[PDB]
Design a protein around this ligand. Structure first.
Ligand code: HEM
Ligand SMILES: N=NC(=O)c1ccncc1
Ligand SMILES: N=NC(=O)c1ccncc1
Length: 249
């Protein structure tokens, strides 16, 4: 359903150069997870019915950073500002999504296709669209399905993003990494989810909800057994997420 906009040769040169610079920066700074979170929080506010929110640069706005779900993302925005300044031609919208794509790549994840052309929109969406970590399958479908317009498969695959990073008690209140290798992008999230609670490792109620849902569970099983399958489905889902409301959604 996508019709991507034309951008100038200079714009595409900048995308390519920014991609390289983001790789070096994100790797050096060890901030891939935070950058993936930033891209996800930018995109996850999309409401299909109204065509509001989504990956349009609004996360840099103090008002959106102030959303409780976005605690700590001001760090991400600040970290990227010097780099972004080297690429004045790029939208913040594109830049943040590019950072998310690079975050997955540099941690060993699939190469998520990237298309430029998102415009920076003036108004952040209303607070409260990002999912609540204490809720379950019904809530996930409301947020990802009814609002964003993503599939059940996309929900499980994208939850796999927690294969990198950690929660922080000063941000969400939850604490610690989901995996033994929080800077490595692999299918370990699903492996850990299946094996039960292991000390030192996090499972949110929202993660656990995948285990009991009739549709989500076989996908968890699939991804734990087949990392290639996870990578394919993850790449598809991340692309869709990064393009919500963009070039038709
Ligand atoms: C399925 C619904 C989701 C819920 C309920 C959820 C909830 C959370 C919470 C509570 C945190 C911890 C924030 C903190 O304390 O630092 C977190 C972190 C994170 N989330 Fe999710 N999230 C969801 C989906 C996603 C998606 C779709 C992605 C990307 C594909 C993602 C990527 C991340 C990453 C990489 C971190 C770690 C950030 C860091 O290490 O600083 N999450 N999430
Ligand atoms: N969570 N904070 C970070 O990712 C970070 C912040 C500043 N410098 C390096 C990394
Ligand atoms: N309180 N909610 C959160 O911290 C959060 C929710 C969804 N994704 C990342 C972070």
């Amino acid at each position: 359903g996508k019709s991507y906009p034309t951008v100038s040769a200079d714009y595409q040169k900048a995308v390519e150069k920014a991609k390289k610079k983001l790789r070096g920066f994100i790797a050096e700074k060890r901030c891939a997870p935070l950058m993936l979170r930033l891209a996800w929080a930018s995109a996850g506010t999309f409401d299909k019915g109204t065509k509001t929110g989504g990956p349009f640069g609004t996360i840099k706005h103090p008002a959106e950073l102030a959303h409780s779900a976005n605690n700590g993302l001001d760090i991400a925005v600040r970290l990227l500002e010097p780099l972004k300044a080297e690429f004045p031609i790029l939208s913040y919208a594109d830049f943040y999504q590019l950072a998310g794509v690079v975050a997955v790549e540099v941690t060993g994840g699939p190469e998520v296709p990237f298309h430029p052309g998102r415009e920076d929109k003036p108004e952040p969406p209303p607070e409260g669209r990002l999912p609540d970590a204490t809720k379950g399958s019904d809530h996930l479908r409301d947020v990802f399905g009814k609002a964003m317009g993503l599939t059940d498969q996309d929900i499980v695959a994208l939850s796999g993003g927690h294969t990198i990073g950690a929660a922080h008690k000063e941000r969400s209140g939850f604490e610690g990494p989901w995996t033994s290798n929080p800077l490595i992008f692999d299918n370990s999230y699903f492996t850990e989810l299946l094996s039960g609670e292991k000390e030192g490792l996090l499972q949110l109620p929202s993660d656990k909800a995948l285990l009991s849902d009739p549709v989500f569970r076989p996908l968890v099983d699939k991804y734990a057994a087949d990392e290639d399958a996870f990578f394919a489905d993850y790449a598809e889902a991340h692309q869709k997420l990064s393009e919500l409301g963009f070039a038709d959604a």
